[PDB]
Each structure stands twice: as C-alpha cells, then as structure tokens.
Amino acid sequence: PQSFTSIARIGDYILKSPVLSKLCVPVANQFINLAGYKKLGLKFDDLIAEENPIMQTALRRLPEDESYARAYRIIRAHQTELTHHLLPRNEWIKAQEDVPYLLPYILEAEAAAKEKDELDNIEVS
Amino acid sequence: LTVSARDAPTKISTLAVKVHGGSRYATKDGVAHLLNRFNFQNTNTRSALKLVRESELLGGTFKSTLDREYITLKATFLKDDLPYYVNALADVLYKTAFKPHELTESVLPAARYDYAVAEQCPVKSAEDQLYAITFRKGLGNPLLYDGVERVSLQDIKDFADKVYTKENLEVSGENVVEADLKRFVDESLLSTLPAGKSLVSKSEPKFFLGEENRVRFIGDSVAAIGIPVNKASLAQYEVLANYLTSALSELSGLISSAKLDKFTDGGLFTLFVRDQDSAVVSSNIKKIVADLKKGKDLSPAINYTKLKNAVQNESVSSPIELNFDAVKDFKLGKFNYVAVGDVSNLPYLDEL
Amino acid sequence: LTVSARDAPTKISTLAVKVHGGSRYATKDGVAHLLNRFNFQNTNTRSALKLVRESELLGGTFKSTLDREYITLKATFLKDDLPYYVNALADVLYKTAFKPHELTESVLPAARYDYAVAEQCPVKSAEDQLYAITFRKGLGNPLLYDGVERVSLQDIKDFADKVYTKENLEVSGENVVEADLKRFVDESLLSTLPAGKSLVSKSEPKFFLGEENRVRFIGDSVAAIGIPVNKASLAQYEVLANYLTSALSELSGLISSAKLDKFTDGGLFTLFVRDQDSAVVSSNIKKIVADLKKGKDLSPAINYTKLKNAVQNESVSSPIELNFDAVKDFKLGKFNYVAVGDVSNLPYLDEL
Amino acid sequence: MAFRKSNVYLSLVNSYIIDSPQPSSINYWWNMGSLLGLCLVIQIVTGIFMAMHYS
Amino acid sequence: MAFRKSNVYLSLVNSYIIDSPQPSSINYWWNMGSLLGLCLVIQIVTGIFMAMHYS
Amino acid sequence: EVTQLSNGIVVATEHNPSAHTASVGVVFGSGAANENPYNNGVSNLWKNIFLSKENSAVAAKEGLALSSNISRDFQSYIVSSLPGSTDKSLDFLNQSFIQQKANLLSSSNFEATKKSVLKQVQDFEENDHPNRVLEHLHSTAFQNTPLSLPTRGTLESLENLVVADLESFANNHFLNSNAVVVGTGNIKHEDLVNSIESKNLSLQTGTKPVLKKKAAFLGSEVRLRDDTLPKAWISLAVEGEPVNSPNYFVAKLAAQIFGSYNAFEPASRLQGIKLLDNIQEYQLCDNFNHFSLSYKDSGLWGFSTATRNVTMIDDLIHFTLKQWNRLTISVTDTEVERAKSLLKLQLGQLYESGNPVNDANLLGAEVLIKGSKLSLGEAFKKIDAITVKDVKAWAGKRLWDQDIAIAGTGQIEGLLDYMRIRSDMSMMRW
Amino acid sequence: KSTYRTPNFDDVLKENNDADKGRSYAYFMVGAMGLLSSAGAK
Ligand code: HEM
Ligand code: HEM
Ligand SMILES: COc1c(O)c(C)c(C/C=C(\C)CC/C=C(\C)CC/C=C(\C)CC/C=C(\C)CC/C=C(\C)CCC=C(C)C)c(O)c1OC
Ligand SMILES: COc1c(O)c(C)c(C/C=C(\C)CC/C=C(\C)CC/C=C(\C)CC/C=C(\C)CC/C=C(\C)CCC=C(C)C)c(O)c1OC
Ligand SMILES: CCCCCCCCCCCCCCC(=O)O[C@H](COC(=O)CCCCCCCCCCCC)COP(=O)(O)O
Ligand SMILES: CCCCCCCCCCCCCCC(=O)O[C@H](COC(=O)CCCCCCCCCCCC)COP(=O)(O)O
C-alpha cells in the first residue's frame, strides 16, 4: 500500500550517500538471509502480492522465459513446504542470482498510472 | 527537408509532414503498416496519453495514414498554435519509444482489425491481386500485415531508423505563415535528425502484361482489370476514368467503379465489375471488353475531367496534367484480369 | 451391370459396387460430395440405424468413398452372408429417403469436417490448384463442398436420379462365389433399376500447359508441379514416380512426394516439395527443375516399379501396363507450377 | 454430465465440499474453519434437545 | 458492469426480484406466491415478539 | 464576406478568391416535411429526375456537375463548374429545371426513374441499419406531424405516384417567394446579380400552402427485432432546440462534451471523455456518437450506438444516461474549456472546407430561416462566452426527467422496457 | 402497410401534453402513496 516508487527514491539516495550505505546496507544484508526465503528457492519479487491491477499489468509484460521459471520456483516451494522440510543446500538461492527481474516492469506501470490520475484532475487556468 | 506553405484568413490551419516510407519501400511485408501504427505512440518525454489531453485543449488532432508510397504526419488545429504542435510532430519522428509492450497491446490488435475489414470487401482483394501480378516486387508489396512473413520489433525499429531521416522528409502547412513555421522548424528536434539517401527512386518500375489469378470467394463476384500507365499516358487514362463513370457513356450502368492511381513516375488504371449473380457478371464483363476493344472517343469528356481534376487537386500536391487538351482516342490492347467469387461460372482470360 | 468375381478359401469375403458418379460428373461443385454423404442414410423400408444393428451381428461394415471418378459402395463381411448384404446395398441405390432433415443434421455437418481438414494441409491445396488450372471444366471440379456455389436438396436428388442407373453400375465381389451372387443380383431391387446412357466418356480431356497460381498461406511452403499424361505415356510417368522416391536418385532427399494418378483415359503426374523455411524451398525447387531438364535414366528402376506396381494392383482393377520394359529416358519439356505459402520469398515460373 | 453436477440441489454441494479446488500446501492452521462449523451444529443440536426441558 | 450485478450479495437479489424475466400475460392468480412469502414473515415476526411473553 | 440582396429573388453569395471552383444553385424552403403520407417520396423522385441520365449527360457535355439534396426543411439543386464558366450554370438551370419540365416527365423516363428509386429504397430498408434506425427514431418522435415523414419515401407510397403528383408538387412549391439563389467559390456578388438581371429567371407567383399542424414531440418507441443480424443498433434522443433558438450553441457544446467513440482506433481510447472509464473494461460497445440536430420547428438531442455485446446492453444505456445526468449537477470547468476548443475546431472544418457544395447548401439553408448568415468570428465569441451556469441551466431544462424516443433493430432482446430506460433520466440521490 | 406508418393510439392519448402539468399530477399520486406509507410504516 506504500507503493514502490515511494520506497525506491528512499533507496537510491541511501545507496549514493557514503555514510548511509556503509551503516545500514551492512545491516540489511543480514536481514535477507535471516528471512530465509532463499532456502526454499524463492527470488524476492516472487513474494509480492499480485492480486491488483498494477502487478497484473507487469506480470503480462514479463518475458516467457522469466515467467516459466517463475512458475517452477512457486511450484517447488509449494511442494517442499507441504513436506515440512527444506531444499538441499546445493540448490538454494545464492546472493547473486537474486536479482530484481520484476523491478522495471512495476516502475514503468506506476508512472504511467500516476500520469492518468494527475490528468483527470487538471485545473486549466 | 523542403518546406512549402500558404496563408489565408481561414480560422483553422493545417500542418502536414510526409515521409517516403511507402509500402513499396517496406523491408518485410507489412512492416510499413506496423510502424504506421506505432506513429503517435509513447515517446521518451511524453506518453501518447500525454499528447491527447494537451492537443485537445488547444483544438487539434493528429493522424497518420498509410498508402503505397507515404506515411503522412498530419495535424489540423487552431491557427495560433503552430510552434507548439511542430515540436510534437518532431518528437515522434525523433524519439519514439518502440517499447515491446506497445506492439503486443496496441499495434498488433489494431493492425489485425484493418486486415479483417479489407478481407470482407471483394474489390479490395481484386485490386490487391492486380498490384501483385503487375508489380511483383515493387509496388506489389502487400499493404496490410497478415503474418505470412514474420515481422519483429527489431525490423520495425530498423525500418524507422531507415525512413525517419532529414533528407527523406517534407513539411507543409496550409493556412499558416511560412516564415514563422521555419523559425520553429529550424529550432525543433528535426534539426538534429540524421541525413541519408532519398528512398524515392527516379527509375520507373518494370511491368508484366497478361497475368491472371482466381480466388474462390463466398459472396459477390468481381471481374476486375488493371493496366500499367507510364508518365506520358497519365492524361489519357484520367479522362477515360471519368468518361466511363459519366453519363456520356453507355457502359456506365454496367460498370461498378473506375479510377486511376498516380505516383511520381506512373500509375495503375483499374476497372471493376460487381454483382451477386455470376451470370450477370459474366455478360457484363464480355460486353465491356468487346466495346472497349473497338474504340471510344473521350473528347466530350475533356471539360468534365477538368472540373473533376480541379476538385481533386485541393487535397493533393496536384501534379500538372496539361495534356487534357490533347486526349482524343482510346482502344484496349492488353490487360491483366482477376476473377473473384464463383470462379467456375466466371469467364477466363481466353474467353474475354 | 457387369458382374465379375473371384473365389478363395479365405474366411472373409468382400463385395464392391461402383458408380461412375465422379466429381468430374457433378452438376454443381460439391454435389458428388453431398450425395456420397447421403449414401447409407435412411431408406424407405429400413433406417440407417436399422442397418447398423443388423450388419453388426453378421460381421460386416459398409463404406462409401469419393474421388475424382467413383462413388464406391463397398462391404466386407463374413463369407456365408452374401445374399443378405446384396439386398442392403441394392436398397440404397434404389430407394434412399433423401429427407430434408437428413441434409441439415448429418450430411452438412459431416461435409464441413472433410473440407476443414483438407484446408490445413498445404499439399492438398496445391494439388487441388493443379487440377483446376490443367482441366478447367473436366476433372478440375472441386472435390469437396465449400459453398461458393449453392447446392440444394433437389440438385442432390436429381444427381442421384442421374447416376444411379442400371447401365452406370458394376458389382464385384472378392472371395465369394460368382454364380451364387448373380442369382441374388438378378433377384434384388437393382434388377428393376432404370437404365440410361453411361456417364463415362471415351474421349480424352483437353489440357492447358504453362499455368501458374499463387496462394498466401500461413505455415509451410510448397512448390508443386503437375504434368498431363495421355494414355500412351502412363508407363513412363509411373517409373519416374518410383525413381525419384527410390534411393537410386540423388534428388530423393529433396523431394517430399511424387505420384501418378491414373484414369480410364489418362492421368496427372504430380511432384511436391515442402519445407518450413522458404529459403530451403527456393533452392530445392531450382535444383530439381534444372536436373530434370537435362535428363534422367529410369532403366535401373524398371524392376523396382514392377514390384511396386504388383503391390498396388491388389486393391485396384489393375489396368495393364506392359510397357515397363520399353521405358528408357525422361526429360522435362513443359509443366504447370503452383506456389503456396510465403509467395514473396518463393520463385516465379519465369525464375525456374 | 454426471448427476452430482446436473441436479439443482447436488450441484451446490459439489462445488463447495467435493470439487472445490484447494491449495496443495495449506497446513493444519486451515482446519480451524471446519471445526467451527462442527461446533455450530453441536450448540444448536444440543440446544434444541435441551430446550425441550427449560423454562 | 453495474454494481447491482457485480457485487456477490446484490447479484442474488438482482436475478430473483429485479431482472428476472416474467411472462407478459400471467393474471392475478400468479400473485398468490408472494402473498405466502408476506404471510411467512408475518407469522415469524409476530411470533418472535410474542415469544418474549409466553411460558 | 457574405452578401445578400433581396432584389429579384433573394440572392446570397460568399466570395473566396483562393478556390478554383464556383457553385451556383437554388435552394427551396420546402422539404420532406411539406409532403403527406400518400405522396411521400415525391421530393426524392424529383431529385432523381434532375439527376437522371439524359439531364446529367446534357449537363456534363458543357462541363458541369449536378448535385441534389433532399432534407426536412429544404431542397437543394446545385450546379458546380470552373470559375470562368459560372454564367453557363445559370443558363443550364434556367433551361432545364425551371422553364420546361415536359421532357423530364415523359413516360419512359418516369418509369425508369421510378424503378431505380424503388430499388434504392428497397436496398436501404434492409441493408442499412444505423441510418434506418435514425429514420424510425424521427418517424416515432414526430408521429402524425409533418417532420416524421422519411426523406426517401416509403416503398408502398412510391408505387402509387404518377407524373400528375410530381407536377402538382412543382406547381405548389417551386415558387419565387420560397427560393434562394446561392453563389459560392470564385465568383463575385455583383457579377452574379448582374448575370441574373440580364435574364429573367422568374420562377412562379407565390403563396405556397401553409401547414395546418406544427411539429410536436411524443415520447414513444418502435422495436424492429431481427435475430438473423449480428449486432444491435440503437438510437435514443430527447427534444432539442430549433434553429434560431438562444440555446443553439449551448446545445452543440453540451453534445460535444460526450463526443464520439470507436473501440478499434487506438487514439480514441485515450480521450478525456470520462464515459469511456465505464465502457472500456467489458467492451460494452463498438462505437457511439452524440448529436444535436436542429430543424425549423423542433430538434433532437441524443446519441446512437452499435454493439456486439448482446448480453450487456442495459449496462451501456445505464452508464450513458448517468453521464448525461452529471450535466445538470456537477459539470466541471475543465470539461467546458475542452468542449469550447473541440467545438471550434469541429465548426471550423464544417464551414471552411474546400468543397464549395457544402458551403452553398449551408448558406442557402441559413438565409431561408435567419434572413442573414452569421459570420465565423461572431460564432466563436458566443462559444467562448459559454459558462458552467449556462450549461447547467440548459441541461436542467432539456434532459432532466424528460420523455425520450428510442428506436432499435437487430438482437434487441436485451434492450429492456421503456419505463426502465425512462427512469434513468434522474439520479434519485439528488 | 409500411412500418413507418404507425397504428392509431388516439383514444389512449391526452389532448394537451404539457410536461410540467403531466409530471406534477403523476408525482402527486406517487407522493400521496409515499406519504400514507411512511405514516403506516411508522
Ligand atoms: C452458537 C450457538 C450457541 C451458543 C454459543 C450457546 C451458548 C450457550 C451458553 C454459553 C450457555 C450457558 C451454558 C452454561 O454455563 O450453563 C447456553 C445455555 C443455553 N442454551 Fe445455548 N448456545 C447456542 C445455541 C443454542 C440454541 C440454538 C439453543 C436452543 C435451541 C440453545 C439453548 C440453550 C439453553 C436452553 C440454555 C440453558 C440451559 C443450560 O445451559 O443449562 N442454545 N448457551
Ligand atoms: C408459518 C409459521 C407459523 C404458523 C403457521 C404459526 C401458527 C400458529 C397458530 C395457529 C397458533 C395458535 C393461534 C391461536 O389460535 O391462538 C400459534 C401460536 C403461537 N405461535 Fe405460532 N406460527 C408460526 C410461527 C411462529 C414462530 C416463528 C413463533 C415464535 C418465534 C411462534 C410463536 C407462537 C406462540 C408463542 C404461540 C402461542 C401464543 C398464542 O397464540 O397465544 N409462531 N402459531
Ligand atoms: C473453504 O473450505 C471449506 C468449505 O468451503 C466448506 C463449506 C467447509 C464445510 C463447513 C461448513 C459448510 C459449515 C456449515 C455450517 C452451518 C451452516 C451450520 C449448520 C446449521 C444448521 C443445520 C441449522 C440448524 C438445523 C438443524 C440441525 C435442525 C436439526 C433437527 C432437530 C434437532 C430436530 C429433531 C427432532 C425430532 C422430531 C427427531 C469446510 O470445512 C471447508 O474447509 C475444509
Ligand atoms: C417467481 O417470482 C417471484 C420470485 O422469484 C420471488 C423471489 C418473489 C418474492 C418472494 C419471496 C422471496 C419470499 C421469501 C420468504 C422468506 C425467505 C421468508 C423470510 C424469513 C425470514 C426473514 C427469517 C426470519 C428472520 C427474521 C425476520 C428475524 C427478524 C428479527 C427480529 C424480529 C428481532 C427483533 C429484535 C430486536 C432486538 C429489535 C416473488 O414474490 C415472486 O413472484 C412475484
Ligand atoms: C460440518 C461438520 C463436519 C466438518 C467437515 C469435516 C469432514 C469430515 C466428514 C466425514 C466424512 C468422511 C468419509 C467420507 C466418505 O464417505 O468416504 C467414502 C467411503 O470412505 C469410507 O470408507 C468412509 C469411512 C468412514 C468414516 C466416517 C466417519 C464420520 C465421522 C463424523 C464426522 C462428521 C461429524 C468415499 O471413499 P473414497 O475415498 O473411495 O471416495
Ligand atoms: C415478501 C413480502 C413482499 C412481497 C413482494 C411484493 C412487492 C411489494 C414491495 C413494495 C416495494 C414497491 C416500491 C418499489 C420502489 O422502491 O420503487 C422505487 C420508487 O418508487 C416509489 O415511489 C416508491 C413508492 C412507495 C411504496 C412502497 C410501500 C411498501 C409497502 C410494503 C410492502 C412490503 C411489506 C423505484 O421507482 P421506479 O419505478 O422509478 O424505479
């Protein structure tokens, strides 16, 4: 509900600031592996809810290959979860494979839908 | 980049930018159609929805049109707002987005609609079959995109990089001051546009005489003929296209349509006959070809075609045709024939 | 009404009745197809559902087949039940119901299925286009019913009154006693069948050489050629149809299919090339026509075609072809060409 | 089609408790809803038979 | 679509008492069913308020 | 400039030096509203006689083009030519249409024209749905009053006509007091008046019949249902403003607010029209348009639509009428500002197109009612003077809780009853 | 008969159709039913 562009302008500023990117990013990286989704084979963007018209738009622009693989990690996590176990250690998600593959599509869809609501309420002088 | 313009006290002024991105110049069949449907999509700065709410308030609309030879970038708006719109037209010729999701969601569904409508009408199908058999690999390229040859987004982007150049452009504005436009023209993003060879070729195409094709169609039956016209004979076939449709001719009640298409180096003269019962089509086509072969006088139609041409010249570049005074006689020597519909009950080229 | 038969100790015997109700004899395009789908519908005495539960218990099934020349009434059953089935076949040739509700509910939906399947396959479309341009109004009649020409129930009934006659009939039964059949033959309802002129014409058809047609198709690309064959040359084109498909020829890996169709007075020799990429089709077709034009020796294939013909003669009337010993050389002089698919990237008849 | 899907009364039972598609990985915390349905029947049935003796 | 047809609860009311297609020539004998529905509500409502005072 | 002189016949002229063509014509103040149900279609027959093969051939030999237009309130006969030959058009108009009518009313010519017109009307009535639906809307809105007669004529009445009906109509309506002589394009007013004065060019005496009943609007509907057609075509309207009303331009602007929509054009899906926000999700319609038509006695304000979604018609009508309801209570200033420029461009192309025939028809139809022609500039200031209060005042009078007229054909089974539609003309929440 | 010709509704129709008088009479009857109904429901 806190959008995504809103929390990304927070990101790129902290990344560029040397004092902030040294203090909190070394604390953020422990928050990811402590969350522990990597062990079931899940990239982060597979965790976001998709039952709204913004995410449904980005899920359609996603290429076939990244949509087929996305289908398999969700099926594997559903199957592994019902057995009350985890995946073998040699198949977990590493640090470098967890890339933002669903980021640009979410961003290009909100700025085109922000424009729509800012044009429906134009007060021409 | 050759700018011409005229001025008049009319309230509404129009601006036109033409690109020689014609279907005779498409790299793959239907590439011209797809780019034409990208025209006025999103650019880098402003979205295509951004362009709508702005051009509405200032009293203008944009259009893009496809034909055998042109991709026309045309705008009709209120007189004072020439500097604003001239930048909007320049952007599309410069920095179109060409995003992948614009091809799937808008361009492809719209391009399919154009093809579907044209397939129901039989005279369009017959006309497209006369172009194909006369100019095999020149003007005969399919106008619309059906998908028998695969066209990708890269081929669209490469085509736009090929046609959108400085030297392949003409900007014309009717009812607005010429000098004011050029100050905005020399300022806009078209000033930085790349320059290249002019896609227009001065050489005439090569033509084939005597070809026939048959298409089995459920509906009306059509017996169409097409003739190649060079540069010198554009005057003779323009009078004849008006004589047959005028009351001066006896075959005017049998003929369904007749026209001449003109280009910078020639044209194709087309004649059509249409009816539901194939028996009526069969008799009508035989009498027309028999009477045409003996001879027809077009001199009574010279004054009629002058008035007809003057009305046409309002919305076109008006190529000069001063030979209307010298047109005397016509007689059919050779032609291409196409039959559409109940081909079993329709005549063959030997029978005509 | 000429009856021939053979006997053998085989358990299963077959009976065939042939009618010269071929598609070359249809009054309107697709009339033969519709009657063929009325065959084994309801009769006056027994319904078509009545015929099923009876012919099942006695170990037989009925079939009807359509081609360019025949409407075959064929039954395969257990040996002893010849008198029973011979009356069932005679009824359909005599007193078919031809009810209006049989055309709407069964014949039309079934006829549409046959056309739909044939349209997806491109070699059938190319073959149908070679028949049409070679024999314009003889064998070139469309085989299947699409509806470009309207066919009514009266035209079906009139066609059945035209073809179902005494003198337009042949009854043949394999593996059952001939004399026993004739006693049942001379007794059944075909004894009272009307007599008329034999629809079969002894005269040869007229043919045209050098025709071409193009069809835009989404899928594979096909470059097919067709040649008319008279009565004397049936032997030469039968060896050649086997030489190209055999390992003795170098072009066998390029060719997709080759065959000869035979009739009572001639045939059409057809050759096909098929691939997905139109570039491969374009090169393959050029090499084949170039090599064929210089010459090919068919003498090594004479023994191969004798074995090939002997297997074919089992299920056909086996016209005599004793000229296999005299076939020596072949060289292509003229042909008809059809292009289906990506017509822009496929060669023209001039280019080949 | 089958009678359990064709009948007017049995098609409601079919689409709610028989052919209803469930996620394949819900744990024992999702069994709580049916236990409340069981307990609602217990309160009512043990209440009607006990309302026959209460003033 | 309209909210009366899109909502889960209002679409049942829509298809039973609002958009239900009726024959155009049914006489006053077909009004009897709604009168029994009116009378069922009368018995229940006048019974709950009268069950507050009955032993 | 527009110059009008009452000397002789009322002569109007609009000079445009840029044009390369000139039109000269006669516009009569009678139309399809001046005929009765028994001779309905006499005007169309007169038009097709003027446009017959022999008349058109004699015209085209000299180099002239003939146009004829039949409407509710006027009949137009126009001869177009090159600028140098504008005097020849007057000679042809005098010799053929006015002085003599015996040749054009011969037996064979009349029979051929009658058989051609019958064929045209028969084809129209079966294979042209959006326009015949609008014709039936007119016929049901103004029933038993002159304005409801179809302009082409009915199939049953066109058979009964003879040449006597045609000559009677010509005697009763082709009069000097009913006519305007119009000049358009590259011609001068002084030259046109001088050319008329040189000839006589007298039409007749005068005193055309006066109608006993004035046109009236009745809330009603007609349904022509046909289940062998693929779509449903629907036209819906209310009473509007007539020509010479103070609220004419307000009516056209309120119409322009909702505009037109085509589902298959990518650009028209991004228009500022808010109605589309409700339509686009379920593909309720293929196309719609809004109209404000004005006649001498009354008018029509409404919309017309076509759709393949035969199961969701009522949703389309409901959302459209709720957008109409918004006009009275909560129209916003940006809507009016967009509407002003859209209307100005809309009016600009109509009155300033290249073709002089449209200008001739408009000038002739205008001077026959107003007595003078409004200029383009003065039109804009009234358009610019429109405010939100004016739109609200007009909408509260013309479409809030008012009777409607409906006409539909095709798969109109989904179209609900009259009253259910009639109740949608108010909100009940306000 | 042509579809454009319409059937006779004269005995059903009012002589003078005035919208303000017509909608006021209908609304008063609906209003009266509502006014007594509100009293009964209370
Ligand atoms: C969800 C439904 C219900 C709940 C949660 C509920 C709960 C309760 C509770 C907590 C008591 C007091 C128990 C005690 O401490 O003694 C009670 C008493 C009672 N309930 Fe219910 N009840 C329900 C439904 C019903 C129904 C449907 C009936 C009758 C038809 C009913 C009849 C009674 C009676 C008669 C008593 C008093 C008898 C007694 O407890 O000694 N109940 N109920
Ligand atoms: C269709 C539903 C019902 C019918 C047909 C019905 C019928 C009756 C009848 C005929 C009587 C006797 C009336 C008499 O002669 O005095 C009665 C009494 C009673 N009913 Fe009902 N009833 C119904 C529903 C209800 C409900 C739902 C309740 C309570 C919630 C209820 C509570 C009572 C009570 C308390 C009495 C006794 C009070 C009295 O009549 O003096 N009834 N009912
Ligand atoms: C989403 O996944 C689902 C799911 O969809 C469903 C439906 C269920 C199933 C749950 C339910 C449907 C619960 C439903 C509960 C109720 C509706 C309560 C039932 C209430 C009643 C039966 C009403 C009371 C009526 C009686 C029982 C009367 C009994 C009669 C008596 C005592 C009279 C006896 C006297 C004599 C004379 C013998 C699930 O468990 C579930 O997850 C697994
Ligand atoms: C086919 O055409 C149709 C048609 O389809 C329908 C549906 C109807 C309409 C008919 C019906 C739907 C009838 C429906 C009847 C019922 C379901 C009965 C309703 C029963 C109940 C409401 C259950 C009992 C519950 C209560 C009323 C509880 C009330 C609460 C009270 C008294 C508590 C008050 C206490 C306090 C603290 C204030 C027609 O009339 C009709 O033909 C015109
Ligand atoms: C709302 C209250 C209950 C909530 C729902 C919980 C579901 C439990 C219902 C029990 C039904 C299970 C048997 C299904 C069946 O018929 O299988 C039948 C046959 O199975 C059996 O052998 C039945 C085993 C008997 C156990 C039933 C005990 C009931 C306990 C009481 C539960 C409710 C009070 C279908 O078998 P199938 O798997 O071959 O299709
Ligand atoms: C199950 C028990 C009842 C059976 C069903 C019988 C139907 C009667 C229900 C009454 C509703 C009628 C009004 C509809 C409406 O809202 O129209 C509204 C407004 O109409 C009105 O003016 C309301 C008139 C007030 C009368 C209501 C008295 C109720 C009497 C009690 C009935 C139940 C106990 C919609 O009007 P419209 O025709 O423009 O769409």
Side-chain angles (χ1 to χ4, degrees), chain C residues 20 83 90 127 141 147 181 193 201 219 241 243 279 287 292 327 331 349:
Chain C
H20 303 285
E127 195 183 308
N141 293 44
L181 177 63
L193 269 189
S201 313
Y243 171 68
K287 185 187 174 190
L292 281 195
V327 178
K331 169 179 173 187
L349 174 62

Side-chain angles (χ1 to χ4, degrees), chain B residues 29 129 132 136-137 142 144 146-149 208 211-214 216-218 341-342 344-345 348 350, chain C residues 29 129 132 136-137 142 144 146-149 208 211-214 216-218 341-342 344-345 348 350:
Chain B
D29 298 339
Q129 284 268 295
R136 294 176 178 175
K137 214 174 177 52
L144 302 199
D146 43 2
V148 300
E149 175 170 359
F208 301 93
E211 313 287 296
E212 183 214 354
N213 186 352
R214 281 178 175 271
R216 292 175 63 83
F217 175 72
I218 306 181
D342 194 353
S344 165
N345 295 310
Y348 290 74
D350 305 305
Chain C
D29 298 339
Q129 284 268 295
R136 294 176 178 175
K137 214 174 177 52
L144 302 199
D146 43 2
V148 300
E149 175 170 359
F208 301 93
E211 313 287 296
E212 183 214 354
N213 186 352
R214 281 178 175 271
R216 292 175 63 83
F217 175 72
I218 306 181
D342 194 353
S344 165
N345 295 310
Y348 290 74
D350 305 305

